[PDB]
Structure 1
Amino acid sequence: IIGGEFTTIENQPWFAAIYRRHRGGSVTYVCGGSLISPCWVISATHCFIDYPKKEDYIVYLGRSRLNSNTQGEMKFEVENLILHKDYSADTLAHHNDIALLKIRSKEGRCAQPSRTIQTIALPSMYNDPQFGTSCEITGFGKEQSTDYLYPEQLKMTVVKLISHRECQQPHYYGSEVTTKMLCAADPQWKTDSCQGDSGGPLVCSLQGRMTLTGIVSWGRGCALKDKPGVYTRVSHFLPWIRSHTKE
Structure 2
Amino acid sequence: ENQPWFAAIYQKNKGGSPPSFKCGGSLISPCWVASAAHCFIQLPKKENYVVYLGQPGEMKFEVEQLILHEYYREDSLAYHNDIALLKIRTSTGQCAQPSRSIQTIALPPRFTDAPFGSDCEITGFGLYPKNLKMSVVKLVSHEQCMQPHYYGSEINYKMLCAADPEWKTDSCKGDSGGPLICNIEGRPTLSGIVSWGRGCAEKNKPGVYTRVSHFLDWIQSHIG
Change (3 A) 1:36 1:180: farther
How many residue pairs get aligned? The number is: 211
**C-alpha displacement of 1:244:** 1.5
Change (3 A) 1:83 1:53: same
Please give the secondary structure, in 2, of the residue aligned with 1:108: coil
Alignment of 1:1-247 (within 5 A): 7=1, 9=2, 12-26=3-17, 27-63=19-55, 69-70=56-57, 73-125=58-110, 127=112, 129=114, 133-138=118-123, 141-143=124-126, 149-150=127-128, 152-169=130-147, 177-178=163-164, 195=174, 198=177, 200-217=178-195, 221-246=199-224
State TM-score, norm by structure 2: 0.80
Mean Cα deviation higher: 112-121 or 97-106: 112-121
Change (3 A) 1:218 1:96: farther
**C-alpha displacement of 1:41:** 0.2
Please give the secondary structure, in 2, of the residue aligned with 1:165: coil
Mean Cα deviation higher: 210-219 or 26-35: 210-219
Mean Cα deviation higher: 229-238 or 99-108: 229-238
Please give the secondary structure, in 2, of the residue aligned with 1:121: coil
Please give the secondary structure, in 1, of the residue aligned with 2:77: coil
CA distance in 1, matches of 2:76, 2:199: 13
Equivalent AA in structure 1 for residue 12 of structure 2? R
Gap regions ≥5 residues in structure 2? 150-158
**Retained in 2: the 8 A contact 1:127–1:235?**
no
**C-alpha displacement of 1:48:** 0.3
Greater per-residue strand proportion: 2
Q: Percent identity?
A: 64
CA distance in 2, matches of 1:82, 1:244: 9
Please give the secondary structure, in 2, of the residue aligned with 1:205: strand
Change (3 A) 1:124 1:151: closer
**Retained in 2: the 8 A contact 1:92–1:219?**
no
Equivalent AA in structure 1 for residue 59 of structure 2? M
Equivalent AA in structure 1 for residue 40 of structure 2? F
**Retained in 2: the 8 A contact 1:80–1:101?**
yes
CA distance in 2, matches of 1:196, 1:235: 23
CA distance in 2, matches of 1:176, 1:47: 19
